[PDB]
Amino acid sequence: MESKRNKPGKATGKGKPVGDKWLDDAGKDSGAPIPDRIADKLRDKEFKSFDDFAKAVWEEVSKDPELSKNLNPSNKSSVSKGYSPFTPKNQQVGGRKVYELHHDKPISQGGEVYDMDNIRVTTPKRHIDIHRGK
Amino acid sequence: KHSISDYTEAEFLQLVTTICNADTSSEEELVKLVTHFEEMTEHPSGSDLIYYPKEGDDDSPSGIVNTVKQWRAANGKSGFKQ
């Protein structure tokens, strides 16, 4: 096995319309989708790895006034560097304190790495709840 | 780096500013600083002091330092060096 997430690939997919409180949704259900406007900016671009893709996602968030507007000034500085914003304390798990990008259909069962319709934005707590129920 | 009373207030303000500015080389290094901040303040709001302030709390660097400082004063905990 070689890791697909560690290999370059091309972003695809549509994402979904979201509101300015989109990140509140990362803590419930299956997480928040990739915002359609983020998908529009990233689609058809090639990325070096899934980590490289995730950085581009957070950069695009900081550049979109609607998606970054609920972020406080410190969280805004974070996304401007391409880091994931910090979740509320009550959504953190140990050293996992920032929003996470996860694959909805697992890559091992045919989920695509850079398929933006296969990616969910979760809090560490929500991801762990989901994972523990599998 | 062991306990908040190892920092002068001016040192702690620098630390807090680093965090608010995301003045690090990586996300990992920022999360490490944030963890240390929470360990230093011992405040139960944790990283929320920085990222999710209560309505009408000052979330500037000096604002955060003052909130920490007063909370520790109110709760009989040690202050800053010097």
Side-chain angles (χ1 to χ4, degrees), chain A residues 4-65 67-122:
Chain A
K4 291 172 71 202
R5 78 182 55 247
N6 288 334
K7 297 185 185 322
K10 187 193 87 154
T12 62
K14 309 168 165 34
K16 297 211 183 313
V18 307
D20 54 26
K21 71 91 100 310
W22 78 287
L23 289 174
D24 301 4
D25 293 329
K28 60 193 62 130
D29 298 303
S30 285
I34 296 293
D36 57 1
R37 283 193 306 283
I38 301 314
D40 287 348
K41 299 285 209 157
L42 298 188
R43 174 205 307 123
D44 298 320
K45 299 194 168 222
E46 174 176 315
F47 295 90
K48 306 346 109 186
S49 66
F50 192 70
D51 287 350
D52 184 57
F53 173 81
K55 184 186 170 43
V57 166
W58 298 118
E59 282 165 350
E60 287 311 321
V61 167
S62 80
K63 296 169 182 175
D64 187 298
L67 304 163
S68 70
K69 119 169 98 159
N70 199 63
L71 256 16
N72 91 325
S74 297
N75 253 337
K76 278 188 167 74
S77 302
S78 194
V79 287
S80 306
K81 307 205 74 166
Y83 312 157
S84 187
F86 284 85
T87 69
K89 180 174 185 65
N90 63 18
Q91 293 289 324
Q92 306 181 345
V93 177
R96 299 159 69 164
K97 294 169 125 81
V98 299
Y99 301 86
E100 297 178 1
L101 304 196
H102 289 290
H103 293 87
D104 176 25
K105 182 165 164 167
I107 301 160
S108 73
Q109 311 180 173
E112 292 151 46
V113 174
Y114 305 97
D115 170 2
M116 295 185 275
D117 294 320
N118 193 42
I119 297 161
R120 309 301 302 181
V121 179
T122 65

Side-chain angles (χ1 to χ4, degrees), chain B residues 20-73:
Chain B
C20 295
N21 282 357
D23 279 343
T24 64
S25 48
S26 72
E27 175 190 287
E28 288 83 1
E29 291 296 331
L30 179 56
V31 173
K32 160 141 217 165
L33 275 201
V34 166
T35 296
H36 179 249
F37 168 88
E38 298 173 57
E39 295 169 3
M40 296 302 109
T41 66
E42 302 174 317
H43 190 114
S45 275
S47 68
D48 285 0
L49 296 180
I50 302 171
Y51 296 108
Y52 297 89
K54 291 172 169 266
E55 157 197 72
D57 274 11
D58 175 350
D59 62 351
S60 67
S62 76
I64 298 165
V65 176
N66 180 250
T67 290
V68 169
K69 201 178 147 167
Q70 295 182 151
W71 180 87
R72 289 179 67 86

